[PDB]
Design a protein around this ligand. Structure first.
Ligand SMILES: [Cl-]
Ligand SMILES: [Cl-]
Ligand SMILES: [Cl-]
Ligand SMILES: [Cl-]
Ligand SMILES: [Cl-]
Ligand SMILES: [Cl-]
Ligand SMILES: [Cl-]
Ligand SMILES: [Cl-]
Ligand SMILES: [Cl-]
Ligand code: NA
Ligand SMILES: [Ru+3]
Ligand SMILES: [Ru+3]
Ligand SMILES: [Ru+3]
Ligand SMILES: [Ru+3]
Ligand SMILES: [Ru+3]
Ligand SMILES: [Ru+3]
Length: 129
C-alpha cells in the first residue's frame, strides 16, 4: 500500500506513535517518507546482506526474520514479510522497540540525515488529526 501523507500520519497516531518516546508525529512521517516513500511494500538489500522492509525500512540483521541473513537476530519476533502489510501494526510495534533501544530515532539513518533538526511539523500540516 502506498499511503498518502495525512493518511499515514493518522494511521501512525491511531497506532500510538504521536509523541512516542518524545518524537512528535511529523518525525515518524518524515522518516517513513525518506525510508519508503510511504510504500509498505518497499524492500532494499544492504551491503552486509541484510534487507530493509516496509514503511520504516526495518532491518533483518536485528529485528525480523527473513531466513537469509546469517548470524542475525529477530528481536521483534516477526517474519520480515509482516513488515510489508497494508496494516502497519507490525511495523509500528517493531519501530517502538527500535526507538527504545538507546539511540532513539538515530537508528534510522535517513531520519538523522534528512529529518533531524528540520521543521518536521510540516509533514503533518493540513492534516485532519
Ligand atoms: Cl486501526
Ligand atoms: Cl506530536
Ligand atoms: Cl500531531
Ligand atoms: Cl536469517
Ligand atoms: Cl493500519
Ligand atoms: Cl531520544
Ligand atoms: Cl511534528
Ligand atoms: Cl510547519
Ligand atoms: Cl495529534
Ligand atoms: Na533476522
Ligand atoms: Ru536502513
Ligand atoms: Ru540493540
Ligand atoms: Ru536493547
Ligand atoms: Ru513550521
Ligand atoms: Ru485522530
Ligand atoms: Ru487528536
Amino acid at each position: 500500500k502506498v499511503f498518502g501523507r495525512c493518511e499515514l500520519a493518522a494511521a501512525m497516531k491511531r497506532h500510538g506513535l504521536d509523541n512516542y518516546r518524545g518524537y512528535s508525529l511529523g518525525n515518524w512521517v518524515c522518516a517513513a517518507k525518506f525510508e519508503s516513500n510511504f510504500n509498505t511494500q518497499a524492500t532494499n538489500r544492504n551491503t552486509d546482506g541484510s534487507t530493509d522492509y516496509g514503511i520504516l525500512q526495518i532491518n533483518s540483521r536485528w529485528w525480523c526474520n527473513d531466513g537469509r541473513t546469517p548470524g542475525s537476530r529477530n528481536l521483534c519476533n516477526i517474519p520480515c514479510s509482516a513488515l510489508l502489510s497494508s496494516d502497519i501494526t507490525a511495523s509500528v510495534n517493531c519501530a517502538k522497540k527500535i526507538v527504545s533501544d538507546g539511540n532513539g530515532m538515530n537508528a534510522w539513518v535517513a531520519w538523522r540525515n534528512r529529518c533531524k533538526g528540520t521543521d518536521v511539523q510540516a509533514w503533518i500540516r493540513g492534516c485532519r488529526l
